[PDB]
Amino acid sequence: EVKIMVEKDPVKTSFEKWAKPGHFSRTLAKGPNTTTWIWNLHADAHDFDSHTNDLEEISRKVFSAHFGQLAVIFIWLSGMYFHGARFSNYEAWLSDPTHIKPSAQVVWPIVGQKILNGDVGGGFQGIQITSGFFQLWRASGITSELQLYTTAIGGLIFAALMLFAGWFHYHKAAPKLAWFQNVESMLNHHLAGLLGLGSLAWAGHQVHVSLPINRLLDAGVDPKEIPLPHEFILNRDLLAQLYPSFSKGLTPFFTLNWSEYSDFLTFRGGLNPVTGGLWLTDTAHHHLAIAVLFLVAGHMYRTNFGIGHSMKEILEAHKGPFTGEGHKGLYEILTTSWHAQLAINLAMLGSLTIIVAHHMYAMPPYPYLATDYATQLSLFTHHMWIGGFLVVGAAAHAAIFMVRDYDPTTQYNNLLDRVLRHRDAIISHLNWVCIFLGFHSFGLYIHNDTMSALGRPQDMFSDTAIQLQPVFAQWIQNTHALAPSLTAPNATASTSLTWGGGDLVAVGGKVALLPIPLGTADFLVHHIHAFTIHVTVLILLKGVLFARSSRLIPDKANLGFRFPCDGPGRGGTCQVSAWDHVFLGLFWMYNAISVVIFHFSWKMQSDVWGSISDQGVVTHITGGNFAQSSITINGWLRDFLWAQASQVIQSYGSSLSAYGLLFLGAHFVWAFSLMFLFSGRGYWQELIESIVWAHNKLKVAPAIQPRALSIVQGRAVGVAHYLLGGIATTWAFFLARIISVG
Amino acid sequence: AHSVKIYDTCIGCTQCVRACPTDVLEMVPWDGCKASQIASAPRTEDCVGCKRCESACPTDFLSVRVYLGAETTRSMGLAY
Amino acid sequence: FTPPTLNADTPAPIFGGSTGGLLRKAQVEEFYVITWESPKEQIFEMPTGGAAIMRSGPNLLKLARKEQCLALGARLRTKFKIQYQFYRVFPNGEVQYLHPKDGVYPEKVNAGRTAVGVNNRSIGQNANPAELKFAHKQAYDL
Amino acid sequence: MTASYLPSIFVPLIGLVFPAITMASLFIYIEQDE
Amino acid sequence: YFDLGEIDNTTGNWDLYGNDDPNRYNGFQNKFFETFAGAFTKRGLLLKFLVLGGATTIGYLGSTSSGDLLAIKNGPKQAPIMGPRGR
Amino acid sequence: VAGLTPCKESKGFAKRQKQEIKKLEGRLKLYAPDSAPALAINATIEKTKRRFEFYGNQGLLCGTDGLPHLIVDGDQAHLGEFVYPGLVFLYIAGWIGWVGRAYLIDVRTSKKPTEKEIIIDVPLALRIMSKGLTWPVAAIGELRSGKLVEKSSNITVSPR
Amino acid sequence: QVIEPLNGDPFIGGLETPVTSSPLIAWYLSNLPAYRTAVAPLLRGVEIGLAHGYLLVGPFVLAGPLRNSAVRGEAGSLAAAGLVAILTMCLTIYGIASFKEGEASKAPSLTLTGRQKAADKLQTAEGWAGFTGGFFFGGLSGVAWAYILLYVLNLPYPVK
Numbered sequence A: 001e002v003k004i005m006v007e008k009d010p011v012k013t014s015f016e017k018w019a020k021p022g023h024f025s026r027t028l029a030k031g032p033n034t035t036t037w038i039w040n041l042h043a044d045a046h047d048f049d050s051h052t053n054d055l056e057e058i059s060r061k062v063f064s065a066h067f068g069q070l071a072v073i074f075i076w077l078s079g080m081y082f083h084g085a086r087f088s089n090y091e092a093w094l095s096d097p098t099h100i101k102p103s104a105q106v107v108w109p110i111v112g113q114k115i116l117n118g119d120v121g122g123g124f125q126g127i128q129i130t131s132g133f134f135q136l137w138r139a140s141g142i143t144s145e146l147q148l149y150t151t152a153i154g155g156l157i158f159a160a161l162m163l164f165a166g167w168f169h170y171h172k173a174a175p176k177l178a179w180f181q182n183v184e185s186m187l188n189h190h191l192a193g194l195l196g197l198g199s200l201a202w203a204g205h206q207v208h209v210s211l212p213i214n215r216l217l218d219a220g221v222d223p224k225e226i227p228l229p230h231e232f233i234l235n236r237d238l239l240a241q242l243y244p245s246f247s248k249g250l251t252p253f254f255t256l257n258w259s260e261y262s263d264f265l266t267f268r269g270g271l272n273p274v275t276g277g278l279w280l281t282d283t284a285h286h287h288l289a290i291a292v293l294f295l296v297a298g299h300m301y302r303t304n305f306g307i308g309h310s311m312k313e314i315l316e317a318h319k320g321p322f323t324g325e326g327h328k329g330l331y332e333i334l335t336t337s338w339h340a341q342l343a344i345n346l347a348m349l350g351s352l353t354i355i356v357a358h359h360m361y362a363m364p365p366y367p368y369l370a371t372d373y374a375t376q377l378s379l380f381t382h383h384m385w386i387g388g389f390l391v392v393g394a395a396a397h398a399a400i401f402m403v404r405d406y407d408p409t410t411q412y413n414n415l416l417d418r419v420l421r422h423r424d425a426i427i428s429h430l431n432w433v434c435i436f437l438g439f440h441s442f443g444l445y446i447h448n449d450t451m452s453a454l455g456r457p458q459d460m461f462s463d464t465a466i467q468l469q470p471v472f473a474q475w476i477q478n479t480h481a482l483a484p485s486l487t488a489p490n491a492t493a494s495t496s497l498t499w500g501g502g503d504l505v506a507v508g509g510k511v512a513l514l515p516i517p518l519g520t521a522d523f524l525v526h527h528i529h530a531f532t533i534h535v536t537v538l539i540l541l542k543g544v545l546f547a548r549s550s551r552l553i554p555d556k557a558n559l560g561f562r563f564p565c566d567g568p569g570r571g572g573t574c575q576v577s578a579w580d581h582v583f584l585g586l587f588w589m590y591n592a593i594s595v596v597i598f599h600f601s602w603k604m605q606s607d608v609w610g611s612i613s614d615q616g617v618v619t620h621i622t623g624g625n626f627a628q629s630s631i632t633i634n635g636w637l638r639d640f641l642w643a644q645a646s647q648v649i650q651s652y653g654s655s656l657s658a659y660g661l662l663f664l665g666a667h668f669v670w671a672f673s674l675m676f677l678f679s680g681r682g683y684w685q686e687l688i689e690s691i692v693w694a695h696n697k698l699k700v701a702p703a704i705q706p707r708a709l710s711i712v713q714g715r716a717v718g719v720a721h722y723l724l725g726g727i728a729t730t731w732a733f734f735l736a737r738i739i740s741v742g
Numbered sequence B: 001a002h003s004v005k006i007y008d009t010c011i012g013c014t015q016c017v018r019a020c021p022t023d024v025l026e027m028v029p030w031d032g033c034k035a036s037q038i039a040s041a042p043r044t045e046d047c048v049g050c051k052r053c054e055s056a057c058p059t060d061f062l063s064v065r066v067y068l069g070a071e072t073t074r075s076m077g078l079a080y
Numbered sequence C: 001f002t003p004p005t006l007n008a009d010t011p012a013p014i015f016g017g018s019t020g021g022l023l024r025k026a027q028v029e030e031f032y033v034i035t036w037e038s039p040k041e042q043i044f045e046m047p048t049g050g051a052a053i054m055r056s057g058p059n060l061l062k063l064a065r066k067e068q069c070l071a072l073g074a075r076l077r078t079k080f081k082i083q084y085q086f087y088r089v090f091p092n093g094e095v096q097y098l099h100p101k102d103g104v105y106p107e108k109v110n111a112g113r114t115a116v117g118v119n120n121r122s123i124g125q126n127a128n129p130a131e132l133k134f135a136h137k138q139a140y141d142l
Numbered sequence D: 001m002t003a004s005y006l007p008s009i010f011v012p013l014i015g016l017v018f019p020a021i022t023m024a025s026l027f028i029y030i031e032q033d034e
Numbered sequence E: 001y002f003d004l005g006e007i008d009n010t011t012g013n014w015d016l017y018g019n020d021d022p023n024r025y026n027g028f029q030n031k032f033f034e035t036f037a038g039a040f041t042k043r044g045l046l047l048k049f050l051v052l053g054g055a056t057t058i059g060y061l062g063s064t065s066s067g068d069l070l071a072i073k074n075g076p077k078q079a080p081i082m083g084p085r086g087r
Numbered sequence F: 001v002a003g004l005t006p007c008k009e010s011k012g013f014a015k016r017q018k019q020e021i022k023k024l025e026g027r028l029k030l031y032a033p034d035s036a037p038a039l040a041i042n043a044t045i046e047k048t049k050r051r052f053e054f055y056g057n058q059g060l061l062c063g064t065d066g067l068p069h070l071i072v073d074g075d076q077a078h079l080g081e082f083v084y085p086g087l088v089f090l091y092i093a094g095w096i097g098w099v100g101r102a103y104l105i106d107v108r109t110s111k112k113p114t115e116k117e118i119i120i121d122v123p124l125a126l127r128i129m130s131k132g133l134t135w136p137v138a139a140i141g142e143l144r145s146g147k148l149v150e151k152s153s154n155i156t157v158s159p160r
Numbered sequence G: 001q002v003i004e005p006l007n008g009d010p011f012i013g014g015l016e017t018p019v020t021s022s023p024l025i026a027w028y029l030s031n032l033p034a035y036r037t038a039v040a041p042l043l044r045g046v047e048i049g050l051a052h053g054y055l056l057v058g059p060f061v062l063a064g065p066l067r068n069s070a071v072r073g074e075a076g077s078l079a080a081a082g083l084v085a086i087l088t089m090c091l092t093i094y095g096i097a098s099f100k101e102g103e104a105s106k107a108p109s110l111t112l113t114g115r116q117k118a119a120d121k122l123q124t125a126e127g128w129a130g131f132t133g134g135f136f137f138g139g140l141s142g143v144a145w146a147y148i149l150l151y152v153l154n155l156p157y158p159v160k
């Protein structure tokens, strides 16, 4: 039954719908009458469910919007490869990366901003980049900037292809609703065709291109005299001199002599002592294994060839005595609602990005990634912020599924109906564990601050005071260090250096990684992390569960998603909406992720990042003060927020002064947020009425009536400036401090 | 509890009653409009005070008007 | 209009149980009982949260607030063509019939009901609070 | 300091006993049905 | 589930975890506790001697405490720290 | 004036010129003399030396910090600090205010007055953006003729 | 099949979960001194006091400020007995506020089944009066017996 359903020319490619701005909504198609029409024009621009009730045109809109997003990402990748090709020192950094900072952005000498073109090394001036593209291209085997320019113009070609496909799948041949409802085929071609063949193709690149070029880069060979990537494919003796297993020539693959591929497909583990990044024989065995495993997992579901699984048959057979008729109708949830699938996909992508952040500081995949501390801090911080934003958006589209796509007739006595039936128990027990975590982590911090203030260092929670050692983490770290000897034999070393297997890797005189200690301070800050994640889950899950109704408002689903309130009744119904719970969970994501990256920055500037002198002595950036100062808020304000901010505020008159400017302007955007968050619409409406009177006096009244921003819009503007200003504050402080001390 | 007052600017459009979630408002006969009906609030002790009627009133300025006064267990919207 | 009497023998919709139901306000202050006549066995969204199979005959549902009766009642007046009435039940045993008072819904006009809480002036002809200092009357109730 | 022991007396009463006097007498007073 | 003959059973007035056992102790244990806790019964009487007895018992060990028992009665045991500008 | 020495004879202003080139000369020491980033610092030094020789030749006043201070009182020596570029500004700012006011009058007498503000009529806009050149003669001309201000009987006023 | 509504009623805010109506849990919760509806409320208040009195010596002798001295038995037990005396006054002012002298019992008379039982005497002005004195005598004896078994007899334990 799975086959291609498209139909030809649904909408004509015309600019007459470009001229009318609010064509998608019936309310905005009448033209503007107030200034709130402009904000509802942008608010309802992407909301395709509010435009039409037909899921087919909604799915076509979403598919072509995906293609436009892919075009934007390919334009971005084209820019970052063109910046590597023309405006970088990638060949100079590739000659020796332990002394030259990665830089790929040149500013124009116009208004004094030419001081931002700093001395990054290699006879080059520019903004020192922290995005990690240089180490990524070193891991890709890129030797020259002509390859970067070729990848940039190839990405521009693919961006034109995504734009052409977005036009094609909305105006020339757009698919019908049952094409998008073939989720078994989509999972079969995403697991096997996308993630399986993608891992297999990158495994082939990391067998032929990344591995020999990166082996020659470990030998001190100059990249201008390293042979080009196709010379290893053509001259296979040149490939065989670096790995003798290539001399057999694909006969051990089909005769199952895979151990004869042990020269280039290894389960080593740990870091390259030359570079400080993971081995590419392990990253090529990794990709070959996750490819021979994603291609196996892509042959699971039933499309039209008889073999496979109907996943409705998987779900409807999963029913239990504590649930009864559970998992039934969830296929009808996840094939008739885009928001439910968006909630699941956003939760997995955000949690996965958090997995990426941890599995990159800890197991650095790229050569000279760990020893360039700016790249490590910026990559962890960026992926934590993206992951937190995507899990808050997961709860957002979960709540939009409840208020606009949850049909109660098709969901009786399943899992979702019963989760709604005891949502008071879920939110109340979550409330209890959040308050318990809040006292038992932050009140422990307050206790340490109080007894450190009262001159009682023995009455604290220190490593010298009452100890709170994380015995489960300290045991799982010993279990992961003492693994190769008995539970994981075939490993040369251990998975990560941060486990406890020794191997003090020194690359360029700077510490790549070592055994990470876990003490009372790590216990306290991990309980802060669990507390903040739990409270973010509490607001977000409360907005998902009470999106339909509440004890307060039993008709909340009729009010919608982006409604402000019901009114001042029932004591006041301000921020009853599920949107307002996403709005507050954005703040709790700020709190959670900001303490996560603060613990990260202080923990590895104190216990990981540093330098190694002669006779094996390790001097960290802030030597050993995480175990004693990160247990009090005064240490966090003092030895982290004051001592490490002594490079973002005196960076003026240097190349890092734009970080000082954006540090201060980020404080500005944050205090600007507090204008929108703390205020309300009616005050600003009457102030605008006075300004409209002054305009009426001088005959400069606009016909589009000036209005204050809406209450949902005022909260949106406030949380957008709060996240933008606070995140830009942490970005500026991080990227000034760890560039300055790195 | 809450005092809901109807003024003579009402056109009898009935949407204040339709927006009422606690059945406060009802349409009584009247002689001051084309629709020949005005709203009234007999069950104003059941008023939560949500002002959904004021949001649905098209008359400028409003004909239905809710004044938040003494608040009891009806007008607090509690179930415990 | 003779008010309908609560039968207390019609059964409940098939519901698996919810935590949004009757708390101790039902036990000591009041609770609300909504009674309606159904064409067939359908599934409706519970205003306390959840879904229940409603019966093929008359149905009885116990709710805690008057707003839960209208949120349910307007749900089964627009999605379903079902006439409904609800009551107010006190812990001493008195059942107070609440809606519709005349038997016809308050959106439709009836000649029996009278105008109460209606001002013959507008908002702009309300008196200032400075000339009504220290009185039980306020700017709108006179 | 003239009398060092009145710090040891009045700070426990006005810091512990007097809030326990005042808040318990107010909680009786604010929850009187009258 | 509405009955009009039993208003408590149709509203949630249930002793969910209660028991109707009359007694499970013996007479020797019961007569000891009511004799000793017989002057602690009345709420107005118990609130009087708990405030008056509680004010005395915090002022006694607040004043009879020693240097090792509490540091505020120990006093300074070193030279005072002089501030800046000779103050 | 105001206890400030002129910047041409200020020892602190010449000290800031000395320590700015010396900062840029030490940046030049780690580059090749014919290299491309060294040409940017060499252009930065000539931009700095042009700047300090421009500030001293305009009669700027330098304080004890070695920094040029502006006298905005309306001094006959100091017209180009505030008075001359202020009159240049207010002419340009009144140009923005006159062509935005005249556009709203031109679109208020239209069929759909609100569609001409989201979609600005460029032939109607550009024919009055030229007309904003002579705007003090047209603003006070409308002020004297009474067309600049609206009478308070036709102005929406919130009640007391 | 496992989850039921509370006594068959789906519209009361609760469920008959295994954590609520187990054969073991509903046996336990029905024998705890707070749910004995026919025992006199001074006697069952002595057991609510003995329990809470005992348990509170532990976090006050092992975590308090005077935990590193030889007075750690005396400091923590009087600190544990201090929380008994405060909570007795919290029990005193609760019964003054909630229950009036001469009123009825604010208690559910009906059991899980349809059988009619006598009213619970604890939720009265005189029942909470004898409950408060039961907590005071039981709590002060529960602290003193835990102090006797820890710092008078000094029984061997891994932590004390």
Ligand code: CLA
Residues within 6 Å of the ligand: A063, A066, A067, A070, A161, A179, A180, A182, A183, A185, A186, A189, A190, A192, A193, A194
């Ligand atoms: C084996 C075939 C296969 C593969 C490789 C993919 C791959 C992809 N699908 Mg697709 N899909 C397929 C078949 C396949 N699809 C089937 C059978 C169904 C119908 C049931 C769908 C329906 C479906 C929809 C509705 C959507 C996708 C989307 C996606 C994209 C994932 C999003 C992203 O950023 O990934 C990484 C992206 C890339 C690596 C870019 C690669 C682009 C190149 C040109 C290949 C894509 C063309 C084609 C699918 C395979 C040609 C192979 C060619 C290289 C030889 C990606 C392009 C999503 C998307 O973004 O929409 C555009 C989306 O939601 N798929």
Ligand code: CLA
Residues within 6 Å of the ligand: A042, A043, A044, A045, A046, A047, A048, A342, A346, A389, A390, A392, A393, A394, A396, A397, A400, A561, A562, A579, A582, A583, A586, A720, A724
């Ligand atoms: C995979 C990603 C994804 C998907 C598909 C969508 C899709 C959607 N979102 Mg969103 N959402 C997600 C993730 C995503 N979101 C995340 C990351 C969050 C957390 C912020 C949420 C939270 C969420 C809520 C709270 C709601 C939606 C809603 C919307 C809908 C339309 C919004 C619109 O018209 O755009 C409008 C676009 C803008 C107004 C652009 C503003 C961009 C941000 C806010 C400010 C600028 C940030 C920028 C980086 C700073 C530059 C500053 C510089 C210019 C000076 C649409 C269904 C809305 C809805 O009604 O859903 C049906 C809505 O109510 N989203």
Ligand code: CLA
Residues within 6 Å of the ligand: D011, D012, D014, D015, D016, D017, D018, D020, D021, E050, E051, E054, E055, E057, E058, E061, E070, G064, G065, G066, G075, G076, G078, G079, G081, G082, G083, G085, G086
């Ligand atoms: C001005 C206010 C006031 C004062 C006088 C004290 C006094 C005290 N605090 Mg406390 N505290 C207060 C406010 C107060 N607190 C508040 C507002 C906070 C909340 C943020 C705290 C939080 C706090 C904690 C968390 C703890 C202290 C503890 C202590 C003790 C430290 C001295 C010591 O080592 O004794 C050591 C202990 C003893 C000598 C035990 C004496 C206990 C006596 C015998 C109680 C007797 C009955 C009592 C008087 C009945 C009161 C009746 C009522 C009328 C007040 C001491 C009893 C510590 C302690 O040990 O508490 C007892 C401790 O664990 N304080």
Ligand SMILES: CC1=C(/C=C/C(C)=C\C=C\C(C)=C\C=C\C=C(C)/C=C/C=C(C)/C=C/C2=C(C)CCCC2(C)C)C(C)(C)CCC1
Residues within 6 Å of the ligand: A662, A664, A665, A666, A668, A669, A724, A725, A727, A728, A731
């Ligand atoms: C131009 C102009 C002007 C000026 C302006 C001003 C006044 C300023 C302000 C400003 C300030 C005072 C501040 C601000 C700040 C800024 C910021 C803050 C921004 C940002 C942006 C962005 C885009 C971001 C980015 C990011 C993200 C998103 C994430 C991560 C981080 C980062 C940072 C990277 C005026 C009006 C005169 C006139 C007209 C024109």
Ligand SMILES: CC1=C(C/C=C(\C)CCC[C@H](C)CCC[C@H](C)CCCC(C)C)C(=O)c2ccccc2C1=O
Residues within 6 Å of the ligand: A675, A676, A677, A679, A680, A681, A684, A685, A707, A708, A709, A710, A711, A713, A714, A715
């Ligand atoms: C300031 C503020 C406003 C007023 C905000 C407004 C009116 C937005 C202003 C947007 C711009 C500055 C005006 C429109 C600009 C036009 C594009 C014209 C261009 C003119 C210059 C910007 C070039 C609210 O409406 C509000 C509502 C609820 C809570 C808090 C607040 C709040 O704090």
Ligand code: SF4
Residues within 6 Å of the ligand: B006, B009, B010, B011, B012, B013, B014, B015, B016, B017, B038, B039, B053, B056, B057, B058, B059, B062, B063, B064
């Ligand atoms: S909504 Fe307003 S105008 Fe319409 S009937 Fe009600 S009071 Fe009258």
